[PDB]
Design a protein around this ligand. Structure first.
Ligand SMILES: *C(=O)N1C[C@H](NOS(=O)(=O)O)CC[C@H]1C(N)=O
Length: 261
């Protein structure tokens, strides 16, 4: 299609590998580009981990308010919130917000630990019907983004379907879905990514990610003015291990998608 032409040209100009999956919930139409190829999720995997803890809280009713110890040795490579609470505690709700809205990697490791390790995140994915997602490692090694390595990857098609079920469908209970959407809408890291390619009047909740090989990712739920929501995944990775981030490529992909509606 014409959108296919434009996405391919954007990819060729970028020098990297671009993966796009859109679901338009107005009519269940889709736009897919490399939609069945695996890409390293990096920090976008935090959505699955926070959602899995939310699901646990449906039956452990006070789980989100349980204190979790933060030790100096727990700090990893990017810990803007957890570093303020070392030698103290944060609750699982606070850790979820830190992971999602500030992309705190120590907070993500606490979510993973609550779930019993990376396999617990994968098990939640399987429980909600996602047979493609896999989490294999903790932070920071889940971000190595090595070409051909299936660890810590998913496909754009699978992640868009799962993000729709989590934020607009019934994979979570009503209050928990609302909490996840509230957290995504309050993200601090997203203005240069999918959001930058969309009309300013549209409402976006998103989670970004980045890693080695210049990996630059964003996954979003979008409420355009006057119409039903969209779900958009944009994943991007590059040939050189030390490549620079390319958030502009994600914005350009979203802009192409928004024009083609
Ligand atoms: C997640 O991809 N990471 C944690 C933090 N995320 O910030 S981003 O979502 O704005 O990219 C830093 C980058 C990355 C990592 N390598 O840990």
């Amino acid at each position: 299609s014409a959108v296919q032409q434009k996405l391919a040209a954007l990819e060729k100009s970028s020098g990297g590998r671009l993966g796009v999956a859109l679901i338009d919930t107005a009519d269940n139409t889709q736009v897919l580009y490399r939609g069945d190829e695996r890409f390293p999720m990096c920090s976008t995997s935090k959505v699955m981990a926070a959602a899995a803890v939310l699901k646990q809280s449906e039956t452990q009713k006070q789980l989100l308010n349980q204190p979790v110890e933060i030790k100096p040795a727990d700090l990893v490579n990017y810990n803007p919130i957890a570093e303020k609470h070392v030698n103290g505690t944060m609750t699982l709700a606070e850790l979820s917000a830190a992971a999602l809205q500030y992309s705190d990697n120590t907070a993500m490791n606490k979510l993973i630990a609550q779930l019993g390790g990376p396999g617990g995140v994968t098990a939640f994915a399987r429980a909600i019907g996602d047979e493609t997602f896999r989490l294999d490692r903790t932070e920071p090694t889940l971000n190595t983004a090595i070409p051909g390595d299936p660890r810590d990857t998913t496909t754009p098609r699978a992640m868009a379907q799962t993000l729709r079920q989590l934020t607009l469908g019934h994979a979570l209970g009503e209050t928990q879905r609302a909490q996840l959407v509230t957290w995504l809408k309050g993200n601090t890291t997203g203005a240069a990514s999918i959001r930058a390619g969309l009309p300013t009047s549209w409402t976006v909740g998103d989670k970004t990610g980045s890693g080695d090989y210049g990996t630059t990712n964003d996954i979003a739920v979008i409420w355009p003015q006057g119409r039903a929501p969209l779900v958009l995944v944009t994943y991007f990775t590059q040939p050189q291990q030390n490549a620079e981030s390319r958030r502009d490529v994600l914005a350009s992909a979203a802009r192409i998608i928004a024009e083609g509606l």
